[PDB]
Design a binder for this molecule. Sequence first.
Ligand SMILES: NCC(=O)NS(=O)(=O)OC[C@H]1O[C@@H](n2cnc3c(N)ncnc32)[C@H](O)[C@@H]1O
Ligand SMILES: NCC(=O)NS(=O)(=O)OC[C@H]1O[C@@H](n2cnc3c(N)ncnc32)[C@H](O)[C@@H]1O
Ligand SMILES: [Zn+2]
Ligand SMILES: [Zn+2]
Lengths: 22, 77, 295, 296
Amino acid sequence: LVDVGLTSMDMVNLMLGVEAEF
Amino acid sequence: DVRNRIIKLVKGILEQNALAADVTPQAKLVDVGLTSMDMVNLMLGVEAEFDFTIPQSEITPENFQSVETLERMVMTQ
Amino acid sequence: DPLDHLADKLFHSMGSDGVYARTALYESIVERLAALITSHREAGTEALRFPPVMSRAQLEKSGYLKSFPNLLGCVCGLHGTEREINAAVSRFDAGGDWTTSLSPADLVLSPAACYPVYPIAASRGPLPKGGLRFDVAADCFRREPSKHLDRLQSFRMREYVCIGTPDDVSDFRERWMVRAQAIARDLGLTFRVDYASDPFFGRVGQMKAVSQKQQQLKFELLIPLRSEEQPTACMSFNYHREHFGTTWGIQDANGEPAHTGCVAFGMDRLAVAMFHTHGTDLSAWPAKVRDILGL
Amino acid sequence: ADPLDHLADKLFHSMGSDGVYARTALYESIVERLAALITSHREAGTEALRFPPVMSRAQLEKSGYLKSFPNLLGCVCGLHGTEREINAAVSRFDAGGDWTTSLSPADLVLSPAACYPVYPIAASRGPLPKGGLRFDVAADCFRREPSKHLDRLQSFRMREYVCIGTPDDVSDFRERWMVRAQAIARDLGLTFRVDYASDPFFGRVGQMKAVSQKQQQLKFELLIPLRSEEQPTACMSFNYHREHFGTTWGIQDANGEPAHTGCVAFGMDRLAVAMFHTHGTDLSAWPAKVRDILGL
Ligand SMILES: NCC(=O)NS(=O)(=O)OC[C@H]1O[C@@H](n2cnc3c(N)ncnc32)[C@H](O)[C@@H]1O
Ligand SMILES: NCC(=O)NS(=O)(=O)OC[C@H]1O[C@@H](n2cnc3c(N)ncnc32)[C@H](O)[C@@H]1O
Ligand SMILES: [Zn+2]
Ligand SMILES: [Zn+2]
């Protein structure tokens, strides 16, 4: 998931979307 | 002259709180055996006996070595 | 705990977990470790020594509150009037709490040695080609009380910091990762180097650590003290990317926001690792280790 | 402008706070050589201890520091609340407010003097042997006195030799250190005098405590003219505490009496600055005897 381009802020904002969807 | 009498009284009282000594006008208060907490307690005995408050630049070794220099203290106001 | 037996020879209790007085023996080894590190300093490296305190505003700007607000020690004092301060003292005399009269100063206890170096560097204008290199040290503080001799609240850190293009910084850390292992090896130490993360505060921070490990921004030289399953990080190798360049507006020689990185030596952990490995009797230390240290 | 101000370019860098400076290699090499010199005069039997820049608050409270200099004291505070509380404090900071309202005191202070932690350590060993005990202590100290003068810092290095024993032990000790300290100042080519002095005790009563201190001559200072001869900078001190710490910590001398203590204290940062002001910032130009003494 990091080879994609996700940095720490990107990953933080990513945990936020998943906790949100379900 | 009443001042000198009741000053020597508080000194002899704080001195009697630990030891005993001869109190002279020309004698230095440190030689008598006055410690810091003593000089503190002696300042509070002088301010309570004559109900005044010792002011600025008057809390000095000059004005506080001998009762004879504590003369010019109480008797400056 | 496996390190507890070293206390009698190395430390005296100062009445607070993680805060110890240091014996002549212990300090002699910290000193020799420091001299050894110095002897490996790259050429063109500017050396600065920091006090144990730093500007609170500078640390706030650096984002320390976003990462480790639970570790920060702030400096506070009685800033009031003579009457207020006397009342504070009076409560103390009565056996009450004078500390309620405390208010924050504009200072914190430095949590890491390198923080104050970025604004200093930034005040110099654009970086030369090849960036800048600093040798920094400080007594740091982290509010994490522990009885373990390898987890202190007050401890010496020593760092080499690199500011420059991404290549200058990556190459820098590459050199040091190799060099640090050669050092540990010459010290007769057992270690491995591994990916790590800083202990970011909160659940949000838990994810920052994951991404930090994943981006491989942090390595640690890990030494088995108490157990080989639970080794102690005695050195770290840190890539910050443009984080500090951006924050302090440092420009590399190509107009772009500078990258930064640092190599950190935990002086007290290294010294404890030395005494744990070789013992408290210096005459018995291996000949090669005694030599490397100039004993 | 201050006469010392010109020394900044070569010795320090701003850390964004008055009295708190980064030290250049040039400056540190002289602080280190001064430390080595002092160490070379250590008396045999002197136990060397190094303290961190923080110490137990209870220990400092018990030592009577609040009662004397409550305004110089730096306390350690932290965010000790719950994770929700700590998060809220940080979010307030993000939104232009003040996170520090969530700070609470820790059990630590920044050390105002190198010697304070040594007394409880001495006490824990029982009765003093005949002749007393001698310690070599050092600490980065802190005093909440912001200033722009290079000879008045908030964070500075103190080195002390400390004596704990009978009154005869302590005064013999202070006597000999007063002579040796001048000799060192002389070997370093410094212009100095030694005079009685007092500590800046706090408040109205504090001034009387100073008076009594000056009268008992419990404190001397080695003074070096840096800005003016009228206000010279105190670079060393020679302190007699009588039985204060001995009583406070339950330290008994070899005769069963509450022990006396005293100490000789070197201001490492003031000595270093005094050296650069006296001999300039070019080391090769320093007097040959001074270069020699320092092992330059
Ligand atoms: N700027 C770069 C950096 O900060 N990096 S790092 O945060 O990783 O800590 C630097 C080093 O300080 C040492 N250290 C850290 N915490 C402690 C502690 N509580 N007790 C003793 N030593 C410690 C340890 O050896 C660590 O590797
Ligand atoms: N325990 C014995 C003692 O403490 N004694 S003393 O309180 O007098 O400070 C010891 C010495 O610390 C140095 N020093 C003190 N304050 C400062 C300051 N703000 N900046 C630089 N140096 C300083 C100075 O050289 C002084 O003589
Ligand atoms: Zn760093
Ligand atoms: Zn002292």
